[PDB]
Design an enzyme around this catalytic site. Sequence first.
Site, mmCIF file in Angstrom:
data_model
loop_
_atom_site.group_PDB
_atom_site.id
_atom_site.type_symbol
_atom_site.label_atom_id
_atom_site.label_comp_id
_atom_site.label_asym_id
_atom_site.label_seq_id
_atom_site.Cartn_x
_atom_site.Cartn_y
_atom_site.Cartn_z
ATOM 1 N N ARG A 1 0.755 -1.075 -0.322
ATOM 2 C CA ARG A 1 -0.046 0.064 0.387
ATOM 3 C C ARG A 1 0.564 0.776 -0.210
ATOM 4 N NH1 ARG A 1 -6.094 -1.418 1.801
ATOM 5 N NH2 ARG A 1 -5.164 -3.721 2.874
HETATM 6 N N1 LIG Z 1 -6.064 2.488 -9.629
HETATM 7 C C1 LIG Z 1 -5.019 1.436 -8.770
HETATM 8 N N2 LIG Z 1 -4.033 1.479 -9.699
HETATM 9 C C2 LIG Z 1 -3.095 0.515 -9.741
HETATM 10 N N3 LIG Z 1 -3.116 -0.140 -8.539
HETATM 11 C C3 LIG Z 1 -4.074 0.039 -7.536
HETATM 12 C C4 LIG Z 1 -5.213 1.185 -7.687
HETATM 13 N N4 LIG Z 1 -5.364 0.871 -6.912
HETATM 14 C C5 LIG Z 1 -5.471 0.271 -5.859
HETATM 15 N N5 LIG Z 1 -4.333 -0.093 -6.087
HETATM 16 C C6 LIG Z 1 -3.895 -1.061 -5.399
HETATM 17 O O1 LIG Z 1 -4.271 -1.384 -4.651
HETATM 18 C C7 LIG Z 1 -3.785 -0.813 -3.127
HETATM 19 C C8 LIG Z 1 -5.402 -1.105 -2.108
HETATM 20 O O2 LIG Z 1 -5.810 -0.098 -2.486
HETATM 21 P P1 LIG Z 1 -6.767 1.000 -1.198
HETATM 22 O O3 LIG Z 1 -7.841 2.106 -1.315
HETATM 23 O O4 LIG Z 1 -5.526 1.044 -0.009
HETATM 24 O O5 LIG Z 1 -7.238 -0.425 -0.470
HETATM 25 P P2 LIG Z 1 -9.053 -0.340 0.155
HETATM 26 O O6 LIG Z 1 -9.858 -0.669 -1.172
HETATM 27 O O7 LIG Z 1 -8.726 -1.512 1.563
HETATM 28 O O8 LIG Z 1 -8.772 1.094 0.355
HETATM 29 C C9 LIG Z 1 -2.962 -0.203 -3.392
HETATM 30 O O9 LIG Z 1 -2.571 0.350 -2.013
HETATM 31 C C10 LIG Z 1 -2.279 -0.324 -4.649
HETATM 32 O O10 LIG Z 1 -1.509 -0.802 -4.552
HETATM 33 MG MG LIG Z 2 -8.760 1.621 3.075
#
Ligand SMILES: Nc1ncnc2c1ncn2[C@@H]1O[C@H](COP(=O)(O)OP(=O)(O)O)[C@@H](O)[C@H]1O
Ligand SMILES: [Mg+2]
Lengths: 90, 486, 467, 467
Positions: free
Chosen positions: B348
């Site tokens: 993340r």
């Molecule tokens: N649009 C995107 N493009 C590339 N990688 C992504 C994208 N969205 C998320 N990720 C990957 O997936 C991880 C999870 O995102 P996050 O929003 O923190 O998860 P959650 O849905 O638990 O909030 C990110 O830290 C990133 O590494």
């Molecule tokens: Mg989150």
Amino acid sequence: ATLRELRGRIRSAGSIKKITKAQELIATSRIAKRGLCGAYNAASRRRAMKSATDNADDLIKALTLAANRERQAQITQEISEIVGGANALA
Amino acid sequence: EEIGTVIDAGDGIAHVEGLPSVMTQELLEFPGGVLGVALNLDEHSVGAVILGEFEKIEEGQQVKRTGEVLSVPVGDAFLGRVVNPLGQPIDGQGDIAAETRRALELQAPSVVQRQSVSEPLQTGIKAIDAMTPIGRGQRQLIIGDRKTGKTAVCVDTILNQREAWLTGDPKQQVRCVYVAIGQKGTTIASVKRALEEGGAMEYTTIVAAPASDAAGFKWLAPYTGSAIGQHWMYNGKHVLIVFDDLSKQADAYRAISLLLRRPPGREAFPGDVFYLHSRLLERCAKLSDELGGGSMTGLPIIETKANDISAFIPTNVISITDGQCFLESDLFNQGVRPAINVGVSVSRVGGAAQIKAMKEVAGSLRLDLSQYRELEAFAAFASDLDAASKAQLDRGARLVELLKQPQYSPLAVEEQVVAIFLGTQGHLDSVPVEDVQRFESELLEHVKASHSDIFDGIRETKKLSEEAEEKLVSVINEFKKGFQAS
Amino acid sequence: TAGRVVRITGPVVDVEFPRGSVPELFNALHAEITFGALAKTLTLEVAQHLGDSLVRCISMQPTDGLVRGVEVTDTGASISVPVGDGVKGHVFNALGDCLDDPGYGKDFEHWSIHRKPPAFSDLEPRTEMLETGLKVVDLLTPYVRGGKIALFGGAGVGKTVLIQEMINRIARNFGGTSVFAGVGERTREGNDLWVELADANVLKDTALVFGQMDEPPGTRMRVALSALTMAEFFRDEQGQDVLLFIDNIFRFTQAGSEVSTLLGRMPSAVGYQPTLADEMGELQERITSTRGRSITSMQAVYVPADDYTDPAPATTFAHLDATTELSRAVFSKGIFPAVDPLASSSTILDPAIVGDEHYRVAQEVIRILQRYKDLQDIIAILGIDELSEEDKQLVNRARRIERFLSQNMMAAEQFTGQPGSTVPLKETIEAFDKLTKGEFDHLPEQAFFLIGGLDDLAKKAESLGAK
Amino acid sequence: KTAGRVVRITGPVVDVEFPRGSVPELFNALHAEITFGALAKTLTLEVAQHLGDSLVRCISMQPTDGLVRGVEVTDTGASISVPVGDGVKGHVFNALGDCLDDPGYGKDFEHWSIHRKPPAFSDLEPRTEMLETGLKVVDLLTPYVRGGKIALFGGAGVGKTVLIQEMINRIARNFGGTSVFAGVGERTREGNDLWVELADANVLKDTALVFGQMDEPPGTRMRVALSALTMAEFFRDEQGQDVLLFIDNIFRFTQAGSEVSTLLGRMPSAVGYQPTLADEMGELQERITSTRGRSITSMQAVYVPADDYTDPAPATTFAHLDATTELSRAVFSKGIFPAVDPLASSSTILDPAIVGDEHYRVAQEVIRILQRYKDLQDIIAILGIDELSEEDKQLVNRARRIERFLSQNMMAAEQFTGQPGSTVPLKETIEAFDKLTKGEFDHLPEQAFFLIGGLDDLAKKAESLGA
Ligand SMILES: Nc1ncnc2c1ncn2[C@@H]1O[C@H](COP(=O)(O)OP(=O)(O)O)[C@@H](O)[C@H]1O
Ligand SMILES: [Mg+2]
Ligand SMILES: Nc1ncnc2c1ncn2[C@@H]1O[C@H](COP(=O)(O)OP(=O)(O)OP(=O)(O)O)[C@@H](O)[C@H]1O
Ligand SMILES: Nc1ncnc2c1ncn2[C@@H]1O[C@H](COP(=O)(O)OP(=O)(O)OP(=O)(O)O)[C@@H](O)[C@H]1O
Ligand SMILES: [Mg+2]
Ligand SMILES: [Mg+2]
């Protein structure tokens, strides 16, 4: 997730069974008149697809039994947790 | 002088009457040097968790309140030592000269006491360092079925800090805390032997709560390790803490809660099990420059059963940490070692945890591999694939081979950059898949021997200059002229 | 007329008061922890009247160090937080204390965080599209200005990245006030958001309220109410358009479930508190536009274990105008945003509001993707060649469509290294109309992955040897 | 005074009231008398809890049928203790140390308490020294460790006890040290059979047998393992003997603990198990270990309830082992003996630094082929092998031959088949499986690989089949 996976597998097996039964009937028709022919390369398509349809039926049956075991077990475990909490609060 | 009395006892739990002024979480002294912690405070009595040797507890025994909450000694003397959750040495090497003491339950740094994770913590493992990079102050969950290489990943990461330690510079050094919870004693001894053979006990502390320990010790051990690491973190040092493993600590906490007859929840776990792990893991942080800039990087380990990541504790910890490396036995048995499931593993923090050169050569590696796995599944039984799909499949096969890596075989960051460069820039497309590994190694050796300037540039500048990239392309082509593809 | 602590069990404290001085429910009480290392002032919220002048309360801070019999003081009121234009540009905790400048806002007007929702007669349904520039959102889950939007998903599927993307696309040019409620999420993420908003110069218009996952359950229960009280002040007193972001609202429910049995409640199904739907209803029904007073709210909803049947997300679904549902399956394929186009929904996706062309194109995309989902198992076992010609054509089209729904996002550049893109709605509709007709069937599917509009498609295709 | 009285009887759990100042310590052995004719006996109770008000809760080692409230209970002042020394060899004991084949034997021996601490951490030294068995599957894929901990997991009737007999034959017969066998909650007639078989093989004179079997109260089934381990620990720590410790079945110890926990009024954990499941297993297992210079090779059978390897009991057992042989119902159904799951089984010394590069490479190749074969079962179940690529068909034929060749005619299987067993040197095993993975036997029929020893056996069987 076990029950969800089992239900997904049941859906997949049902679709495969439908397609293979259709193909077996088409092969029946073509007999009177690709590589899904059993050991032919190693009529034959009809037998192979009948075998595949029977195998998919058996798979659906086994998966449904496993899914019902999981459904019952989940009901039992949920009740166990609910009643354990209630007892501890008794 | 308040003195309570043991009114009942059993299974590592005591109930003590009196002690009207005892605090919640206070440490209590039972006769014969036995220690307990007050958890349940009600008008009738105090529920206490015994921290070992509870077989000596008895109804009627006098209980003294020490006036202090759970705290452990902290200081540099703990480096190289094996201790128990109370900070007491168990390696038989004598006393530990503590610098001071630290309460286990000190609040994590606030939102305004932190700064964004920006420094790499190199594991030496290409898959992790390229696709799920770990920065200093990050919490990366290592989760998977048993025997999938979780401890291997964590121990390799600890070992890979040996060069940084030898630099002597606190801004570069990483001090490691390995927390063994519920492990068999000989397993802890084997981890310690692996660390000693690699020179890591110079900068590593082991907090050990073997399976024989009381459930109280297994519950406390992560917190003790965290306090030890926090002492260094708040003093400008960089720390790596491994929790091997949090599932056993959750089980120990559940045992304690059920013995205290606290109402159970899912899988009979207490309501605050998520809070246990979240409070533990939010103390891993990257401090603001005002607080010294220190960091603690968390590597919690979770064991799943039958690859069921939807169980309670795995779900909790996944929702807590800054990403996870999912290890799978199917990938392991297939030769994918480390058995990282690329599709569902993620960091993340991302490119901020990588040097510029790595971020350059690996910016889209994880997505490319996810798409490759999708295409490989989809095109498994296709007989007539188009040119684009065939090229994608061949590239993906070469990349998968490139990320394979044996145990105890760290790669320096510059070497990892060169290897990923070979992969993603198409220089492996002419190499047979079964030779990729060999090719890579040979190529690296060659660069190590006659073109060490490429490595030196990447190391000093954290970048691959245009001139260095052109030189590397030239060296790769010249090497390919003579490489012997079996 | 002060109380005294009688029982302490984790975050729940029993307090005995003199007869005739029992604090009202939800009143805030103060107790002292004097142990030097942990010394603090606990704020307790009255949860129950146990009878015999005993009240059960939920601590807002950790109770470690608390002693039985210590004095408890009744403030006579509920937890209240500062309100006004002054909260803009500052970071608060659930109790209203300013974290970035401690002591700030002490003299502001203060509002209780417990409040009834708007009256039913004051409620007006909102049907007005909020264009984002994200292809999948604008086509299949169109957002509603002044409406309620949620991002559902399991852990780590991109809810937070998409929340930041929406702060980028919607809040940056917003003409009103923004309130961000961090509910039981990562402190590192809060610091990152704070810094990013300061960098974008959006912070001056934004009030941040944080209660992190490392806080006790009481804080995670009440932080959402605090942020919502600030937003309600902006809606009803200042009378300006408000943007409300919550990440993650599920934590609220989770926090409530963590203290349920300690409060003496028999557990419900799946370990949740029996009061799940009711507490969620109070909170969610406060998050709403009223006639002439707009709150556009965007909530990240964690789906436990990816199980969309779980009671928490299942109960949350009824509260939304638009839902973007993120899928682990889509995520694992490398498709970002990991939107499940078949499961997501929006109440304004109908011909009357979005127009016949948009509705038709969206329905055709959904139909193709549904057929592709139906055919996936067959393709896995028997291979594509055993499909009919029309099904093969549909499969190729569906693979291209599903890839084209992915997009390089502004908030994702930290992960891909690729800068983001924005696609106008008209261009999105035209592109997907062309795709559903097979106008791009000759381009490699890899040409459609993580791009913007049709110009990006052409450029990537030429990069891949197509045209 | 000094003597207690029974206050409550709830099955094999007894609450005893003692005078103030005479409450027995935890784990002390108390004695009560049942006088009713047919059931007359002396109950040994073990103090398990201090209930308060001078009451203790104890676990009866014998059934409590016929016990009356108020009968006098006397405190021995010490825990249960068993005879130790060279004299326990050649004799059968129950959990209390009574000799069954010669009542009264061993009363003059030194007696050791069955409760004690595990070895100090500083004395623990990891063991990495292959214990060659002559079983192809074990030697290749899950090499056993001398002085280490081996477990054989499996569901009902998959071959755990026959494999324990096999390892007694292969390892104990030629053993230069002492052997201890612990029958825990298993068939009594199996205990009789083992006693007679050891007598016939002349291994009995070197072996101490301790039995608490199925028809026992849960307290005895919980403590018999500790009694046998106490004898083993005497041999390890007082005589420098290399010790072989066989336990069948340790799951029964966990199950007895669960029964007792329910009887003690403890709140159940998941699947109804005791909350202290991991703690109890940890105490017992940590005692079962080698120390620096002092070797115990321990082999444990582990029952798997309802073939559920996720069940908490085996799940917590896994962590305590150096080598794990997992028996599979699916493998058993194929007639493959030993019914080992070659993918699920593991060994900590199966790494190149210990077993050498060639052994490790061949094992990894076998595992890769078997894993690929397993991955293809979805297709094969429906369509068979005729739809796979040429490479996959070659791999599937190779994998079928490999899986059959992992079977072996075991020494202990003669009783069931009349076929004498075979011993395969590890070097021949490595060579044979190298050749198998390379395709050098792809022409031989599958059955030629079934239930045989080395390469000469394969040649002879294939010749008998015409190949
Ligand atoms: N649009 C995107 N493009 C590339 N990688 C992504 C994208 N969205 C998320 N990720 C990957 O997936 C991880 C999870 O995102 P996050 O929003 O923190 O998860 P959650 O849905 O638990 O909030 C990110 O830290 C990133 O590494
Ligand atoms: Mg989150
Ligand atoms: N990269 C690797 N390449 C090859 N073998 C490896 C690799 N990493 C680990 N192994 C081996 O895999 C086995 C499992 O390793 P490890 O003990 O780290 O896993 P684990 O998941 O922590 O196991 P456990 O459940 O026993 O704690 C060991 O034999 C280890 O040597
Ligand atoms: N190697 C073998 N060759 C032939 N038959 C065998 C073999 N191993 C086991 N069997 C058959 O399987 C039966 C069960 O074996 P065994 O008693 O070892 O199983 P188990 O796992 O210990 O069973 P349980 O759970 O009932 O105690 C044996 O009685 C014999 O009938
Ligand atoms: Mg491990
Ligand atoms: Mg048996």
